[PDB]
Swiss-Prot record:
Protein name (database record): Endothelin-1
Species in which this protein is naturally found: Rattus norvegicus
Gene this chain is encoded by: Edn1
Residues of the full protein shown: 59 to 73 of 202
Domain of life: Eukaryota
Length: 15
């Protein structure tokens, strides 16, 4: 992972 991290680590929701 790398750019994806920005999305999930930040927003932090399973959704």
């Amino acid at each position: 992972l790398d750019k994806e991290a920005v999305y999930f680590c930040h927003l932090d929701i399973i959704w």
